[PDB]
């Protein structure tokens, strides 16, 4: 029903709005290839042309929010795919012939080149997936899936769909970012998710169930440990 509304440029405001709704149902199901297959049908230049009723200011914002969310899963699945392709150690041939000794001196020296790049590519996929996770979590100008315009007409379906999407996906993006920070050994920053969340600037903690909180608190205590093993205090600061 989207291609029908996209065809007629005079209904781009209705095409986007309906595209949003449709993508709000799919997001609640985590059908990201569904949401995105719809997201491409929306011409890349829709926003430019449409230029504002309260229903069009929000739908433009919602659309970008949704793109900010999608891009926060496109870059994680790439990052995650990579984390699971680490160069494997050279195989050992105990009691080696002098031939097998040299083939192994090389396989051992080549691996000590690949593991350096698989930290190289990783760092760049970590620097990128992180940025996206903070664009969603710290969404500019009023938080994610939160209308800026407050003079539209009642739409309880949408509005409650926007509260829900926040309670399904903000706890889930936090836990991922924690998994990314922990996986790359950025433990000091892991603990700084408790500033981001509790923050009165975003009030992210309201989007959490009490159980999810504790879970995030048993996730941070885990990063803390590794920081003790390194000799620093729980939060990563030098012990003077």
């Amino acid at each position: 029903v989207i291609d029908w509304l996209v065809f007629d440029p005079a209904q781009r405001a209705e095409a986007l709005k309906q595209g949003n709704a449709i993508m709000r149902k799919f997001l609640a199901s985590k059908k990201h290839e569904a949401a995105k297959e719809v997201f491409v049908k929306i011409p890349q230049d829709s926003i430019a042309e449409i230029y504002l009723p309260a229903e069009d200011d929000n739908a433009i914002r919602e659309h970008l929010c949704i793109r900010a969310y999608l891009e926060a899963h496109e870059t994680f699945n790439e990052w995650f795919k990579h984390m699971n392709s680490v160069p494997q150690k050279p195989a050992l041939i105990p009691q080696p012939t002098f031939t097998e000794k040299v083939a192994h001196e090389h396989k051992e020296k080549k691996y000590e080149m690949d593991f350096g790049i698989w930290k190289g590519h990783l760092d760049a996929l970590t620097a990128d997936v992180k940025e996206k996770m903070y664009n969603v979590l710290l969404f500019v100008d009023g938080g994610w899936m939160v209308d800026v315009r407050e003079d539209a007409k009642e739409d309880h379906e949408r509005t409650h769909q926007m509260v829900l999407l926040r309670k399904l996906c903000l706890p889930m993006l936090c836990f991922l970012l924690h998994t990314i920070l922990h996986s790359t050994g950025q433990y000091q920053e892991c603990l700084q998710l408790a500033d981001m969340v509790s923050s009165e600037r975003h009030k992210l903690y309201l989007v959490f169930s009490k159980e999810e909180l504790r879970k995030l608190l048993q996730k941070l205590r885990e990063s803390s440990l590794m920081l003790l093993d390194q000799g620093l205090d729980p939060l990563g600061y030098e012990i003077q």
């Binding site: 969340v197 509790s198 923050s199 009165e200 504790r214 995030l216 608190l217 803390s224 600061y237």
Partner: protein, 278 residues
């Protein structure tokens, strides 16, 4: 009793030997330490460092379980200085408290000590900020009655309110003053008020002073000397607009006058400032 000097000099002599019999048994088996510690039934410094070298946070809990004031001894003896995480469970007793408290599902408890460590915190701003956030997320996740919770988050909202001040420090004067972004200390109201008003802070606008008059209830020396210091640089920057606004932001016998001049539109604005207050 009397002639005690000789009786507290013979104590130091037996105490330098249960230390020379302990060290000797530091290489040996510690299975005998338990019996050497009980034989001279205190010599705790030795059995307390055998419980520290191993992961027996279970032994240092079994020691304090059967003891007369060992707790006040194991803490003053910690400061002077896997199964290792079960001894970490017992060693996490003290400031590492909150950790074994989140673990024990003792959230309310974790909140109390997390706030306590936030308060003593003076060495690192970024860290004082982290602890409150944690304390808060602890308390929110805990099982306070909606009343108690509303108190913890209100007394908290205060802390966040003072902090926010050092938080919003402009990025012009913090590279001017060559300050570390996060690796800086927990500043006090004075330093803040004085730094928000420095000639280094160039783009200082209405909000920089308004907040440099909000940090006066954060004191605990001369109040009304500063009240002047700041209203005066509030005019030097004016280049005789901002004084205007800050009198518009306050809504008054706070400000001084004759004391101030210690001039054509200072009195001129102090007339439609007697009409405003009235």
């Amino acid at each position: 009793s009397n002639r005690e000097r000789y009786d507290n000099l013979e104590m130091e002599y037996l105490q330098k030997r249960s230390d020379l019999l302990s060290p000797l048994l530091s290489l040996g088996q510690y299975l005998w330490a338990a019996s050497l510690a009980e034989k001279y039934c205190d010599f705790d410094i030795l059995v307390q460092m055998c419980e520290q070298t191993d992961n027996q946070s279970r032994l240092q809990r079994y020691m304090t379980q059967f003891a007369d004031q060992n707790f006040s001894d194991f803490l003053f003896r910690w400061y002077l200085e896997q199964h290792g995480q079960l001894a970490n469970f017992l060693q996490a007793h003290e400031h590492l408290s909150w950790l074994h408290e989140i673990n024990s599902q003792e959230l309310e408890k974790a909140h109390a000590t997390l706030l306590g460590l936030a308060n003593m915190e003076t060495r690192y701003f970024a860290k004082k900020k982290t602890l409150l956030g944690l304390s808060k997320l602890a308390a929110l996740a805990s099982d306070f009655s909606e009343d108690m919770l509303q108190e913890k988050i209100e007394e908290m909202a205060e802390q966040e309110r003072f902090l926010l001040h050092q938080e919003t420090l402009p990025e012009q004067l913090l590279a001017e003053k060559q300050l570390n972004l996060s690796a800086m200390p927990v500043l006090t109201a004075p330093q803040l008020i004085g730094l928000y008003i420095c000639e280094e802070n160039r783009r200082a606008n209405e909000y920089d002073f308004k907040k440099a008059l909000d940090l006066l209830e954060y004191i605990d020396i001369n109040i009304n000397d500063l009240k002047l210091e700041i209203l005066c640089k509030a005019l030097q920057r004016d280049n005789w607009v901002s004084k205007d606004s800050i009198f518009v932001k306050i809504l008054l016998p706070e400000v001084k006058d004759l004391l101030q001049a210690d001039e054509f539109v200072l009195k001129a604005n102090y007339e439609y400032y007697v009409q405003g207050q009235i």
